[PDB]
Amino acid sequence: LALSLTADQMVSALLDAEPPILYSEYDPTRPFSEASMMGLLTNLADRELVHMINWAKRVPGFVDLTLHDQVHLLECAWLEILMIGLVWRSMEHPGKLLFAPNLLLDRNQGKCVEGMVEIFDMLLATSSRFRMMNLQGEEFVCLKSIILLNSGVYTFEKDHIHRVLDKITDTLIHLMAKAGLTLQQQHQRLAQLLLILSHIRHMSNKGMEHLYSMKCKNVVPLSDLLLEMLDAHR
Amino acid sequence: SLALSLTADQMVSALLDAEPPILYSEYDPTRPFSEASMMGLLTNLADRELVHMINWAKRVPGFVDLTLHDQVHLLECAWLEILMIGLVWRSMEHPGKLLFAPNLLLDRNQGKCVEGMVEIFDMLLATSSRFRMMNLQGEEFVCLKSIILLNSGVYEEKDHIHRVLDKITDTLIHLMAKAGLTLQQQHQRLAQLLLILSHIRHMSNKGMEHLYSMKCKNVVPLSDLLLEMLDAHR
Amino acid sequence: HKILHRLLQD
Amino acid sequence: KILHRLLQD
Ligand SMILES: Cc1cc(O)ccc1C1=C(c2ccc(O)cc2C)[C@H]2[C@@H](S(=O)(=O)Oc3ccccc3)C[C@@H]1[S@@]2=O
Ligand SMILES: Cc1cc(O)ccc1C1=C(c2ccc(O)cc2C)[C@H]2[C@@H](S(=O)(=O)Oc3ccccc3)C[C@@H]1[S@@]2=O
Numbered sequence: 001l002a003l004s005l006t007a008d009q010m011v012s013a014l015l016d017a018e019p020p021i022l023y024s025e026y027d028p029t030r031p032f033s034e035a036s037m038m039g040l041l042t043n044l045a046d047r048e049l050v051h052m053i054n055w056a057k058r059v060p061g062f063v064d065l066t067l068h069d070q071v072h073l074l075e076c077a078w079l080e081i082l083m084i085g086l087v088w089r090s091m092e093h094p095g096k097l098l099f100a101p102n103l104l105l106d107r108n109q110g111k112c113v114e115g116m117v118e119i120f121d122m123l124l125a126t127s128s129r130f131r132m133m134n135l136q137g138e139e140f141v142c143l144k145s146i147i148l149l150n151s152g153v154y155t156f157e158k159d160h161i162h163r164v165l166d167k168i169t170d171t172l173i174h175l176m177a178k179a180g181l182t183l184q185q186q187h188q189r190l191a192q193l194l195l196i197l198s199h200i201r202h203m204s205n206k207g208m209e210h211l212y213s214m215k216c217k218n219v220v221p222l223s224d225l226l227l228e229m230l231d232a233h234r
Numbered sequence: 235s236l237a238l239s240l241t242a243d244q245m246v247s248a249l250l251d252a253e254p255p256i257l258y259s260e261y262d263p264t265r266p267f268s269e270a271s272m273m274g275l276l277t278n279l280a281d282r283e284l285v286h287m288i289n290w291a292k293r294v295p296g297f298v299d300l301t302l303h304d305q306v307h308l309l310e311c312a313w314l315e316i317l318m319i320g321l322v323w324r325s326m327e328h329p330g331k332l333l334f335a336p337n338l339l340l341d342r343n344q345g346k347c348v349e350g351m352v353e354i355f356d357m358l359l360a361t362s363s364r365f366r367m368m369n370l371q372g373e374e375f376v377c378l379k380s381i382i383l384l385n386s387g388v389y390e391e392k393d394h395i396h397r398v399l400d401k402i403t404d405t406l407i408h409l410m411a412k413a414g415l416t417l418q419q420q421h422q423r424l425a426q427l428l429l430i431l432s433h434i435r436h437m438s439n440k441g442m443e444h445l446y447s448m449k450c451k452n453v454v455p456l457s458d459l460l461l462e463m464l465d466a467h468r
Numbered sequence: 469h470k471i472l473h474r475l476l477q478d
Numbered sequence: 479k480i481l482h483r484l485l486q487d
Contacts, residue, residue: 050475053475054475054478067476070476071470071472071476074472074476122389125389150429151432151436154360154361154433155356155360165425165426165429166422166425166426169425170418170421172425173421184404187404187407187421187424188400188403190421190424191400191403191424191428192396194429194431195385195399195431197429197432198385198386198431198435199386199389201432201433201439202435205435205436206439224471225472225475229472288481288484288485289484302482305485306479306482306485310481458480459480459481462479462480
């Protein structure tokens with residue numbers, strides 16, 4: 001059914017499927033310890049995860065997949081998806097990451113957690129890049145869907161996934177042409193957007209090794225769901 | 235700069251011309267491998283490929299226009315991605331096997347000889363299988379490899395790098411139009427090629443964690459250059 | 469058994 | 479850095 005949608009219908013479907021922005025826990029006395037920051041972030045990430053899973057079901061084509069393939073794709077892409085969402089909502093806050101409306105952090109606060117500032121810097125650089133490209137909401141939702149379908153497709157049905165992926169590419173180009181971009185500008189912008197996905201994969205892998213580290217350090221107990229999504233990368 | 239004034243066909247020729255050679259392994263076929271002996275051969279081979287890659291990079295248009303510090307950064311970031319894409323490219327015509335060298339063609343069962351290597355083997359093979367199904371062309375391959383070099387670490391100077399990147403995108407599209415592909419097919423294929431770069435980043439990150447592991451295990455001593463390129467990812 | 473499984477089939 | 483030297487030529 002995803003294959004018969006127009007570009008504008010694809011955009012509407014994706015826009016409509018967007019998960020909500022969640023709030024962090026409250027009056028958690030600034031300043032943060034390593035343990036308290038990790039606590040908040042873990043609690044937040046866990047809740048975002050539940051919403052992401054339901055968002056995925058609303059991504060055209062995704063439900064046409066077998067359960068096993070849906071699981072595979074989500075286990076592969078979950079952190080990439082949380083990350084791109086984070087940088088998207090951080091766009092209008094240069095220098096800071098908007099984990100939640102009531103939790104906006106700069107890199108100095110990322111120092112409170114051992115090894116986190118490196119990933120912070122990369123997330124901020126990504127936000128800065130989106131900002132400079134003037135990334136649009138319609139483009140963002142396309143990218144996030146691409147991540148869901150693409151990241152795990154090579155560790156496998158595949159043909160259908162690639163068809164859907166092709167459709168989203170069509171959708172992206174459609175959008176750029178509407179913005180008045182020339183043919184050359186369209187392929188250049190398409191290229192630029194898709195190359196950032198490589199950096200996002202990178203941030204995810206570095207973030208992953210790291211969640212594993214803190215688990216080991218058992219500073220804060222990770223949620224059952226996070227641990228599951230985490231162990232899948234092993 | 236000079237890379238920016240090249241035609242698409244001139245870009246292709248420059249890249250084709252800059253290609254490093256295929257190197258031979260040491261290796262005596264009259265003896266199965268141990269973990270230690272396989273790692274020994276692979277390490278010796280990778281080390282020598284590295285020297286050639288570094289010189290290839292200097293022949294990539296735009297690269298030498300960069301400051302030394304930036305050249306170092308890009309290479310430290312992309313080195314394994316580049317070795318990997320080269321490996322899968324030369325493995326294309328050998329389904330089920332990886333052509334590490336003309337005298338060293340291995341299947342996944344042999345990848346089992348090294349602890350943790352078979353996972354990365356499987357991903358490399360899947361990449362090779364994907365290139366094969368897309369009928370990836372040599373001209374497209376060299377464009378992709380250059381994109382990796384310039385893109386992976388791209389975190390003014392940046393603007394120039396992005397211009398060069400834009401040029402290679404132009405070159406890729408130029409090639410596809412020559413192959414008779416329609417506008418829609420061109421965008422779709424461009425997208426498909428660039429998305430595989432995300433998987434290549436992924437393979438690199440997983441491979442990296444691992445080279446670090448074996449170093450620690452000190453099964454085989456890594457070369458001075460490999461260790462340097464490795465430590466850069468820390 | 470997976471929590472992901474449950475969340476996925478709701 | 480060996481990479482440094484190899485780069486410089
Ligand atoms: C990306 C993200 C989304 C979100 O909703 C909440 C938190 C995060 C991030 C991190 C995180 C922290 C604790 C968790 O239990 C889960 C996550 C995802 C950390 C990072 S990470 O998880 O990808 O990598 C690390 C996480 C913790 C410590 C070190 C690295 C991204 C942001 S913050 O920088
Ligand atoms: C990709 C590659 C290119 C090459 O010219 C030589 C070897 C490799 C590969 C590996 C490798 C082995 C020993 C080394 O010193 C360096 C490398 C790169 C292993 C992997 S890896 O390095 O990316 O990941 C691992 C490395 C060592 C052990 C296990 C995994 C890719 C192929 S083989 O599967």
